[PDB]
Amino acid sequence: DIVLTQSPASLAVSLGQRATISCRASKSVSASVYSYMHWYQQKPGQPPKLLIYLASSLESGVPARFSGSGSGTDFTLNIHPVEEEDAATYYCHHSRELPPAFGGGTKLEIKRADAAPTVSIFPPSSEQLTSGGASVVCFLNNFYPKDINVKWKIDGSERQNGVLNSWTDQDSKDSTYSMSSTLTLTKDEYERHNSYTCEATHKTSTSPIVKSFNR
Amino acid sequence: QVQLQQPGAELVRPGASVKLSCKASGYSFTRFWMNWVKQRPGQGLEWIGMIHPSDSETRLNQKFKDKATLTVDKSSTTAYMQLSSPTSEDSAVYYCARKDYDYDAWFAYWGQGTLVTVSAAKTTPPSVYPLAPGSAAQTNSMVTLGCLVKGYFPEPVTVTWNSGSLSSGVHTFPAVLQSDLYTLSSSVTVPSSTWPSETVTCNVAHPASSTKVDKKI
DSSP states (O other), X not given: OXXXXXXXXEEEEETTSOEEEEEEESSOOEEXXXXXXXXXXXXXXXXXXXXXXXXXXXXXTSOTTEEEEOOTTEEEEEESSOOGGGOSEEEEEEOSSSSOEEOOOEEEEEEOOOBOOEEEEEOOOXXXXXXXXXXXXXXXXXXXXXXXXXXXXXXXXXXXTTEEEEEOOOOTTTOOEEEEEEEEEEHHHHHTOOEEEEEEEOTTOSSOEEEEEEO | OOEEEOOSEEEEOXXXXXXXXXXXXXXXXXXXXXXXXXXXXXXXXXXXXXXXXXXXXXXXXXXXXXXXXXXXXXXXXXXXXXXXXXXXXXXXXXXXXXXXXXXXXXEEEEOOOEEEEEOSOOOBOOEEXXXXXXXXXXXXXXXXXXXXXXXXXXXXXXXXXXXTTOOSSEEEXXXXXXXXXXEEEEEEEEEXXXXXXXXXXXEEEETTTTEXXXXXX
């Protein structure tokens, strides 16, 4: 069949610039000068949405900044000027032959200035302590780039076990990143220590950002 | 308004079978062909099969051949896809779309989606807990709060603040699987003047278990 190889697998373009994404087919999709290609846009938690069909034709209702070009086995998706809301996963489709298949996908990211995380730490809840468990959560919001590291320090000593970290996707409007860190401990483990510290290592601060509380 | 409706999620045991429904409205059901797409997180999109609702003529992928069975109900304007013996690799979100044929065939509409989780575990409703700072130095004009949702299987789960009253400064973190149960948290940032007067509530809803949980911070 016709296999599609998209390159690169992830792209980062600054606002106001042009974003190029290539979709290469193993065999020619061109038929009577009209090539079979479709460019889809899918945001997290939603189905894809059509942008350009017939590779040359922008769908009605889609902004004019979306466009496409190429013929035969070569096609591209050009977004100029890129906007903060344009961050999503792009796909390319081919109806030429059967069975139909979709490309590997290209995740577009916006390039902007760095931002420092806002650290907030919430001690375990009184309701959870009643059940015998203890969970201390540490929220990090609005930091760019996504590369960051969090460290838990109990009474000045680090604990790497029992930590669950989760990173979000790029916020459409804010184009920032957010993460949270959950350190789970029992009731006895929580009552036998007092100081609980959450620290963040980000490229915008020479030293970790210290946020803590006392039991 | 053309729309394709699907169930929220479905839980199935290994070796069993499932029946998924795709309901179309606002347009002639038999006048279009129903297609199915598979999306596994991180894998991307994968094509399943197409069917002609009028004559029930089917075309299936060599990969999904004999794994899936397509059928339609013209009285209810609903399309059905039966999957036999799902495995750990068959867990993914399934979509149904109306493929519009003009020259090249694209998808002008997509279904709501259905998450199919293949596991032997039993539905566990979530246990919500409030998260309050309880202290501060008066170094910020904003007040950050959080909500912990843990001990629930399978995904997904809805999390809102005051029944969606606060759409700003809200961050829903993806769930992490630990001990067969998923755990996520969410945070909201409200002005320091709003928090004393206004109450902040964590509204959590689990579609599978059909349970709603409200916890005040």
